[PDB]
From a paper:
pmcMammalian mitochondrial cytochrome c oxidase (CcO), the terminal oxidase of aerobic respiration, reduces molecular oxygen (O2) to water, coupled to proton pumping, providing charge separation (membrane potential) and proton gradient across the inner mitochondrial membrane for ATP production by FoF1ATP synthase. Electrons for the O2 reduction are transferred from cytochrome c on the positive side (P-side) phase of the inner mitochondrial membrane (inter cristae side) to the O2 reduction site via the two low-potential metal sites, CuA and Fea. Each electron transfer from cytochrome c to the O2 reduction site is coupled with the pumping of one proton equivalent from the N-side to the P-side.
The Fo-Fc map of the IO10 model had a low but significant electron density with a peak height of 6 σ. Thus, the peak is assignable as an O2-bound form. The structure is designated as the oxymyoglobin (OxyMb)-type structure. The structure was refined under a restraint condition of Fe-O = 1.93 Å, which is the distance between Fea3 of CcO and the proximal oxygen atom of O2 of myoglobin superposed on the CcO molecule. The final atomic model given in Figure 8B indicates that the distance between the CuB atom and the distal oxygen atom of the bound O2 is 2.64 Å. Thus, this electron density is reasonably assignable to that of the A-form, although its occupancy is only ∼20%. Our findings suggest that the A-form, the lifetime of which is shorter than 0.3 ms in solution, is stabilized by the crystal packing, as in the case of various functional proteins. The present OxyMb-type structure, showing longer CuB-O2 distance than the Fea3-O2 distance, supports that the CuB-O2 interaction is weak in the A-form. An XFEL study on photolysis of a CcO-CO complex suggests that the channel closure upon O2 binding is necessary for the complete prevention of back-leak of pumping protons from the water channel.
Residue numbers in the entry:
A (entry chain N): 1 to 514
B (entry chain O): 1 to 227
C (entry chain U): 7 to 85
D (entry chain W): 1 to 58
E (entry chain S): 1 to 94
F (entry chain Z): 1 to 43
G (entry chain Y): 2 to 47
H (entry chain T): 1 to 84
The structure:
Amino acid sequence: MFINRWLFSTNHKDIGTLYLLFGAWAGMVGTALSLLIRAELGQPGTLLGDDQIYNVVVTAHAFVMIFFMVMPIMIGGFGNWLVPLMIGAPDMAFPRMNNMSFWLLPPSFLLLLASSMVEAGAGTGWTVYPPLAGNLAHAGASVDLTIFSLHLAGVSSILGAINFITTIINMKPPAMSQYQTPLFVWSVMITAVLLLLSLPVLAAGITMLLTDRNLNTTFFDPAGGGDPILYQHLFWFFGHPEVYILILPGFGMISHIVTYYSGKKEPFGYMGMVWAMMSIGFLGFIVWAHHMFTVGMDVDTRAYFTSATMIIAIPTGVKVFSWLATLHGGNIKWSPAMMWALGFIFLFTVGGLTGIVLANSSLDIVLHDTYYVVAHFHYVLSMGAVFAIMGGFVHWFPLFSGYTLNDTWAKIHFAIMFVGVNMTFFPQHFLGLSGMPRRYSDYPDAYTMWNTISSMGSFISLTAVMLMVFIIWEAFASKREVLTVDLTTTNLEWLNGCPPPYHTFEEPTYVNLK
Amino acid sequence: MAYPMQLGFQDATSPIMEELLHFHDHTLMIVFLISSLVLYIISLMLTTKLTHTSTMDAQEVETIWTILPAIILILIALPSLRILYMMDEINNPSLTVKTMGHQWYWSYEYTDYEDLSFDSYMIPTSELKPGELRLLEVDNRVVLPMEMTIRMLVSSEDVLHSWAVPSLGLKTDAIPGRLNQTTLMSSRPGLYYGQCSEICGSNHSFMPIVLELVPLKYFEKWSASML
Amino acid sequence: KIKNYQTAPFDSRFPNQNQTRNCWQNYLDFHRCEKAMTAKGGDVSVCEWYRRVYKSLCPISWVSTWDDRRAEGTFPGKI
Amino acid sequence: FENRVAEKQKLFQEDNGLPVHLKGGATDNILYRVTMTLCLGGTLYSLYCLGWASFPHK
Amino acid sequence: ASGGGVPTDEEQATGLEREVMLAARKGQDPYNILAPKATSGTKEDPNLVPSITNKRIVGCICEEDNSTVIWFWLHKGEAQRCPSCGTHYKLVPH
Amino acid sequence: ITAKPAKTPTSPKEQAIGLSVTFLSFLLPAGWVLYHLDNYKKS
Amino acid sequence: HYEEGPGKNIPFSVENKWRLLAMMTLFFGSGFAAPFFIVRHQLLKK
Amino acid sequence: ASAAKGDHGGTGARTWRFLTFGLALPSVALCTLNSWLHSGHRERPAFIPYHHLRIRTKPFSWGDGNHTFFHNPRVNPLPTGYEK
Amino acid sequence: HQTHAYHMVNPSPWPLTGALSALLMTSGLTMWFHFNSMTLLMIGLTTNMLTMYQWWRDVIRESTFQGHHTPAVQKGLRYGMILFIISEVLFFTGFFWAFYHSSLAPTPELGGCWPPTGIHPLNPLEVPLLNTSVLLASGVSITWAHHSLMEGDRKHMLQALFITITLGVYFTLLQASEYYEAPFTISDGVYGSTFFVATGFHGLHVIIGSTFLIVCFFRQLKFHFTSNHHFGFEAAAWYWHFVDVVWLFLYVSIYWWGS
Ligand SMILES: CCCCCCCCCCCCCCCCCC(=O)OCC(COC(=O)CCCCCCCCCCCCCCCCC)OC(=O)CCCCCCCCCCCCCCCCC
Ligand code: HEA
Ligand SMILES: CCCCC/C=C\C/C=C\C/C=C\C/C=C\CCCC(=O)O[C@H](COC(=O)CCCCCCCCCCCCCCCCC)COP(=O)(O)OCCN
Ligand SMILES: CCCCCC/C=C\CCCCCCCCCC(=O)O[C@H](COC(=O)CCCCCCCCCCCCCCC)COP(=O)(O)OC[C@@H](O)CO
Ligand SMILES: CCCCCC/C=C\CCCCCCCCCC(=O)O[C@H](COC(=O)CCCCCCCCCCCCCCC)COP(=O)(O)OC[C@@H](O)CO
Ligand SMILES: CCCCCCCCCCO[C@@H]1O[C@H](CO)[C@@H](O[C@H]2O[C@H](CO)[C@@H](O)[C@H](O)[C@H]2O)[C@H](O)[C@H]1O
Ligand SMILES: C[C@H](CCC(=O)O)[C@H]1CC[C@H]2[C@@H]3[C@H](O)C[C@@H]4C[C@H](O)CC[C@]4(C)[C@H]3C[C@H](O)[C@]12C
Ligand SMILES: C[C@H](CCC(=O)O)[C@H]1CC[C@H]2[C@@H]3[C@H](O)C[C@@H]4C[C@H](O)CC[C@]4(C)[C@H]3C[C@H](O)[C@]12C
Ligand code: CUA
Ligand SMILES: [Cu+2]
Ligand SMILES: [Mg+2]
Ligand code: NA
Ligand code: NA
Ligand SMILES: [Zn+2]
């Protein structure tokens, strides 16, 4: 029964639990990698004494955080747990294919581990640009294992996207239109359309890299008439959609959390929030070359990409102001989840605004490939995704587990984390403006003070992660079983109790049309 | 070069870099304002016992918060694009210099008249003369005439690199098989520093760029002294 | 003998950041011209402009590789 | 050929508690064990190969 | 030849597919494929909510085009009202 | 949210144990590797 | 059929909080330790 | 944009069989003829060791490492030229 | 029990064996490319084929034999197959992008022209045109099969599907012969790279599609399909039209425009 239940699952909740477990474990790996990065930079000189290893650590840090921590937690974990419950469905459309999306990830992760253990690792950047990632500058198996790791993660998410789109379109109650489905369900649907369209292009691109490295193709090799910049276009045609994939389920959870702890039955401006997510998803496909403003493109192309990129601020701002307008007039419950969501709104806004700075290709000449970009995305992506994830975990942990957290401990954990991430990343703006490149194992002496402070910040967030583990233990250790939650009339996922039975909605909800 | 505890951009050495500084001041003011308004409004929403939990109508307020961001974006984009098109307009240089990236050093070619070329390596920390800068000096600097429009052509003989000099507002990727152009104009004599800006392997952190800007007559003497 | 040559001027055929084709075209132009001028009545001095431009713009290793391949019979452009 | 679908419908609807991947009878079990043995053995072999490839081989 | 030899659903559908097909013939919806049409929802004319058991979750879209659905368990016994719009619902077991 | 009283309450002493054990499980292995970095770099 | 309810819908036991603490410590500690040991492995390789 | 054919009234199997045998398979027959007229081998061209062709940055994982997967000795020269 | 129409699937080992097969194939390719051995790759290919066979066998058991494919379940499978085909279109789009990027801006290494110096393309009016007529014809014949099935005509469904499969096999053998006769190779710069990777992935999809049609052929022989319920046949036809449309784009782009 253990193997049948946990290895042969066809249950959306159990598969969601596997994803949350996997993502949490990956989060520990990616955190350890981030601390090694900051240890190398925490004083001038060399710590590891091997900058190829440093580059391998940076590369792995990013792949682990994006592909094994954020997307499995948001889409595989919260998506599988919550989406069928929020639409009253009895499971996902393809419950058995769903289990394969999960089980592809431990092999994917194993292939990434293998990449770093054989030869000298893939010290390429998570972008894996040729020719550095080609078979002369990265000879041997490491880059190919990385490519295969990405193929398996890609198949996992493409099939998961097929599952979520089908579920959400096809398995709502017959009376419920798409404009009666909760915003988190919208956010997953749109994220899934972005994955469906973007990951195959990445797959095409890394497959061409594979064949340049092993079958004597020259897609990216000028000696055969190829072009390194073609790889960049294919990569970023996937990679800009990817960053919106990483935040969109977060936007969906934030809408639910802010609504809930403002004591509201609904988010402010629902159709605007749907519009804004669809607009961000659409614009997210026509901006990718803002990752390429220094490669030598024509001025009119740089002008188009500057302009198109900035337009995304308009729908994003509608969502930010609408969250504020949801708080407006609320009976505010200062829960730990609410704290995470409030920190999200502010830190995501800061990060989005430095993204608008970078959108200006003239200024990006001086800021590209510097710590200003690192600061931008650790605000908007790293803090953005982590705070939405923490807010969602604290809010829904009692649903998934049946047990309550200690709220005081959870607030302490929030406080430590908020200090730690801001001490870590805010000084990196100064390092970027003053010209410190990213992807460096050591820096000119002038940059010492802010690197020292940033590394000290990284340890504070380590203390938070450790505390988070203790807090989860304490909840399972004390076994305070949930009785009731408020606002179930507008939060259907709670209405089958905590945790819900293995099968829910065997008798579907009754919704009439009138 | 950067200096300890620096918060902003290196001092501008070229007119285009001055333009960027003014454009950044303009944009950062907007960033500060919007960030601070969001923070304020969060605190405003959270500091009253008054409530209103029934459905709120959204249409009117959404005109404001699409039109006003649209106007702000236009006020960023107009100076942004003006500077973009300035950088691109015809500058008619008096000198072309090529630089080729390698793992891990730069080489330079001055082939307008004489066929001069040479390699430029970081000085190891153990060899720095007293008072010289760790990770930044090179053995052979890029001698150039000040107050003159110079065409730099950038490429690579192996992996990607990127040739950058922050105080001149310059960063151009060095791509094998491709010859990227940028223009360089220093308002001042002196030494101007930069660092490889596209990850290129083991020693990415250790292949810096040093320009040495001098009056034309001294540039010519130096050129002349190379034959 | 019109010279006063300093460096290659702006060429409206090649107005963007990628200058590869400008180097390539003048390299071809010079060598096509220098071949033509081995007919009866020709001197390579007429080819000088292309020569100065490609020497100014082209990386030395590109010129050297192209020269080597012209001598091997493996140059892929038409001269 | 004749239409024998009804007899397969009777077989696969028999209330014997078997999951669908084993409900055809003893051949299903054989094919399953072959498959799983190859998968788990290959996975063990792949881990062996990682170990081998993780260290320089002289 | 333009002949035959392809089974029909009536001949060969089985299991739940066949139950759905047969119920559709009789105009019944035991598997909840259709959205029910509301009554006036008064106390005298409550919406009648079938269930195989003694409680079922109702979602109430109180006005046409509301995006917010109001969810609650409806129990056997006296009709209950939507906590948002007050329309009445009465469970009819099975 | 409302909840039944803890089935198996975790005293402050019990918490101090779980916290210390948790923190040690992160810190000791990483500490061992980092302490011995120079023993690695010289091999 | 499977067990349901708090502490029964998970692939690890919470019957004993100290056994749990060992499990969680091995679980999260193994993931956190792994990058330090891979770095060690690469530094030691040659 | 519908060719010069023209036969509906309630589409069906009979019409699509008519297209299959009356248009589609005749087209295949005609292209098969066309093709099995212009078949026969062309003069293979002088070998020139162009550096953008016969690329070898890593040996192939079969044979001697220097032959492509569907190598045809009559028309595929190696980096050093045609085979004996 | 349930009173919805959706399918609660029995716990299954095939997701796990499929995921492990993926680990074995990719680590197997790595070992082939770098450590001169096909062992892991052969195990992975074998377990992948075993996984697909048993998984789709079980889907047949669940639907033809157990009745779980209600109209709602079928509707879900229609969406799933359309979405899968869309993802496959985007995969090919990446290869077309690479082709147009290289061919619209030929670099000096090529001769600054397209086709590159030294490349002698196939004549698109010879076997490539025949292949085009073959796949177009099989789109007509599979539509005849579809209508015959809907009209209850077993014999003509089987004839038309047989013709469709025969044309798919003919395409594959023609393409195998053209690969062998081609005077250029995958190592012939970006021309060979784009040609063989793009037509090669397409050829793989022709083999996949043909195999899917063969599965349908045998299921039809065994009377699995009704005149109204036959989604495996509809999915294989959709997939087959997708393979035909990709070919037309390849023919116009790489063979004809690129020659
Ligand atoms: C929670 C705490 C954790 C601890 C870690 C730190 C957290 C961050 C809090 C820190 C509290 C932040 C208050 C504004 C910071 C601006 C500092 C500055 O002087 O910046 C200067 C400029 C460049 O300026 C120059 O070229 C000239 C510099 C010198 C000016 C002349 C005076 C000479 C002396 C200067 C003395 C200092 C001046 C400062 C003047 C101070 C004015 C406020 O650099 C930059 O652009 C860097 C900007 C990065 C872009 C992000 C902007 C959005 C942030 C708005 C809310 C803060 C979020 C904080 C993140 C969250 C904070 C809550
Ligand atoms: C969660 C992930 C995430 C998100 C959501 C974003 C959002 C944005 N990003 Fe960022 N980005 C990354 C993750 C993300 N980014 C990553 C990982 C990289 C680097 C990859 C690498 O190189 O490794 C990166 C890199 C990156 C670059 C390339 C920089 C370079 O390498 O030189 C650029 C350039 O334009 C950019 C711009 C933006 C913009 C304009 C947004 C916008 O969508 C932000 C819109 C939000 C706001 C503007 C705030 C809220 C709005 C209001 C309150 C309204 C009023 C505001 C105005 C009128 C301005 N990003
Ligand atoms: C007959 C019609 C065509 C049918 C298909 C033929 C075989 C293709 C098999 C799979 C095709 C998919 C990969 C395409 C990779 C390259 C193969 C290109 C097609 C082909 O077969 O190309 C041949 C070379 O094959 C070679 O290198 C060897 C190829 C064998 C090793 C391939 C290893 C790479 C596989 C990578 C898979 C990545 C998949 C990722 C999917 C991710 C999804 C998200 C061409 O032979 P040639 O002798 O060079 O020139 C002929 C001269 N007379
Ligand atoms: C470099 C080498 C890389 C190698 C990577 C290898 C990766 C994976 C190993 C794959 C093994 C596949 C095993 C067969 C999977 C069959 C899935 C399937 O057919 O899923 C179906 C749903 O997907 C649908 O329809 C529509 C979708 C059908 C998907 C079929 C499988 C495709 C797997 C590869 C996809 C790649 C993406 C391509 C685009 C880039 C059925 O869903 P179930 O939940 O099962 O059942 C529901 C029941 O009601 C049925 O009665
Ligand atoms: C030489 C061998 C080479 C091997 C490599 C891959 C090989 C071959 C794979 C060929 C695909 C075969 C798929 C067979 C699926 C059979 C199961 C099936 O068709 O199942 C049908 C459901 O469809 C469904 O799940 C639809 C299921 C969708 C299947 C989609 C398959 C596409 C697979 C692509 C995989 C590779 C991707 C590309 C790589 C780059 C069952 O429903 P019905 O038909 O209505 O029947 C019910 C009636 O009888 C009731 O009266
Ligand atoms: C980036 C995250 C890292 C966070 C920093 C970790 C904080 C410190 C945790 C403690 O780590 C321990 O430190 C000891 C030193 O205090 C080491 O003992 C070492 O040093 C001792 C004293 O010299 C000897 O007795 C031991 O045998 C010798 O192994 C021991 O190995 C190590 O586990
Ligand atoms: C028409 C549509 C849906 C309305 C509904 O059926 O409920 C609504 C939803 C969100 C609205 C948009 C958003 O509110 C954002 C923009 C707000 C401006 O005031 C008008 C244009 C604007 C782009 C809106 C146009 C239109 O009213 C939208 C698109
Ligand atoms: C045996 C079967 C009879 C139909 C039925 O069983 O009622 C018949 C009907 C159609 C026949 C098939 C179709 O005519 C198509 C093919 C015709 C080829 O000449 C032989 C094989 C071929 C595939 C036939 C095999 C067999 O004779 C089939 C399959
Ligand atoms: Cu050269 Cu980085
Ligand atoms: Cu982007
Ligand atoms: Mg760069
Ligand atoms: Na360092
Ligand atoms: Na049909
Ligand atoms: Zn109501």
